[PDB]
Design a protein around this nucleic acid. Structure first.
Ligand code: MG
Ligand code: MG
Ligand code: MG
Ligand code: SR
Ligand code: SR
Ligand code: SR
Ligand code: SR
Ligand code: SR
Ligand code: SR
Ligand code: SR
Ligand code: SR
Ligand code: SR
Ligand code: SR
Ligand code: SR
Ligand code: SR
Ligand code: SR
Ligand code: SR
Ligand code: SR
Ligand code: SR
Ligand code: SR
Ligand code: SR
Ligand code: SR
Ligand code: SR
Ligand code: SR
Ligand code: SR
Ligand code: SR
Ligand code: SR
Ligand code: SR
Ligand code: SR
Ligand code: SR
Ligand code: SR
Ligand code: SR
Ligand code: SR
Ligand code: SR
Ligand code: SR
Ligand code: SR
Ligand code: SR
Ligand code: SR
Ligand code: SR
Ligand code: SR
Ligand code: SR
Ligand code: SR
Ligand code: SR
Ligand code: SR
Ligand code: SR
Ligand code: SR
Ligand code: SR
Ligand code: SR
Length: 81
RNA sequence: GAGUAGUUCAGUGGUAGAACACCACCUUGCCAAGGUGGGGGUCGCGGGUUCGAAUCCCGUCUCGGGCGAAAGCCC
RNA sequence: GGGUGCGAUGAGAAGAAGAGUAUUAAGGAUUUACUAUGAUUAGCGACUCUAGGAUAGUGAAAGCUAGAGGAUAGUAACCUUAAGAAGGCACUUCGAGCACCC
């Protein structure tokens, strides 16, 4: 949901920073794009599903980053609430 | 008048010079820079002169310009 | 504010490598290569020898090719001391702008 990402209080942008955020489990929701490379997505959805956190899948990664406030797009973004 | 190494240029009768570019070592994380080494050239082509032609001479191919009715001639 | 290019498939910054390396100085050492140079007189032109080539003139000996052998430095290669860097990719944290133009 692009709506939940555009809103929310505490978010984090980028795959590396989202997995690093998963390494402390201070994240409430995880939003990942489908059109992104699976080599980069599987790595985060594995740990996300392992932690027991909810895993969402969205269409485009461009509109994702657009919803995050960034101006280039993001492969994976986590709401750290 | 221009034609010379991959490129940009020199070479005003003595077997072809430099810069940049290429290769090799330095140099195993990968490039760049650098510092040392080497390789490469029917001098557009063919004759002529000469011991020796990139250089002078004749012919000829390509390019730019000029003169001319044209053929041709000149730079 | 504007025009491009690039950026979470990581802008940018710092750290870490790079490295006590390249290298500049002060020495030690006297072999390998590269480069420069070879009395006077002829001569445009000479380190010496050899083998081909080729030779008009000048010369004791000529310009090409292929080898081999000599000293003087100037060099890079090897040691010691004191100094001694560096750009980008990859690495590690931080994560949103940076470069060119008016
Ligand atoms: Mg120290
Ligand atoms: Mg020390
Ligand atoms: Mg010395
Ligand atoms: Sr002429
Ligand atoms: Sr001519
Ligand atoms: Sr040529
Ligand atoms: Sr000329
Ligand atoms: Sr020569
Ligand atoms: Sr070579
Ligand atoms: Sr090494
Ligand atoms: Sr180099
Ligand atoms: Sr060189
Ligand atoms: Sr060569
Ligand atoms: Sr050479
Ligand atoms: Sr030649
Ligand atoms: Sr000609
Ligand atoms: Sr000829
Ligand atoms: Sr002829
Ligand atoms: Sr002849
Ligand atoms: Sr001619
Ligand atoms: Sr004529
Ligand atoms: Sr003729
Ligand atoms: Sr013409
Ligand atoms: Sr004409
Ligand atoms: Sr005319
Ligand atoms: Sr002439
Ligand atoms: Sr602007
Ligand atoms: Sr812009
Ligand atoms: Sr574009
Ligand atoms: Sr950076
Ligand atoms: Sr840095
Ligand atoms: Sr440092
Ligand atoms: Sr010194
Ligand atoms: Sr000495
Ligand atoms: Sr020795
Ligand atoms: Sr003399
Ligand atoms: Sr002399
Ligand atoms: Sr000489
Ligand atoms: Sr000789
Ligand atoms: Sr010598
Ligand atoms: Sr002989
Ligand atoms: Sr003779
Ligand atoms: Sr004689
Ligand atoms: Sr020789
Ligand atoms: Sr020496
Ligand atoms: Sr040293
Ligand atoms: Sr921007
Ligand atoms: Sr203006």
């Amino acid at each position: 949901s692009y709506d939940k990402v555009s809103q929310a209080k505490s978010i984090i942008i980028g795959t590396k920073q989202t997995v690093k955020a998963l390494k402390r489990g201070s994240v409430k929701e995880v939003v990942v794009a489908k059109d992104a490379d699976p080599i980069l997505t599987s790595s985060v959805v594995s740990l996300a599903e392992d932690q027991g956190i909810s895993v969402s899948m969205v269409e485009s990664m461009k509109k994702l980053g657009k919803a995050c406030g960034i101006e280039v797009g993001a492969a994976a973004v986590a709401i750290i609430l």
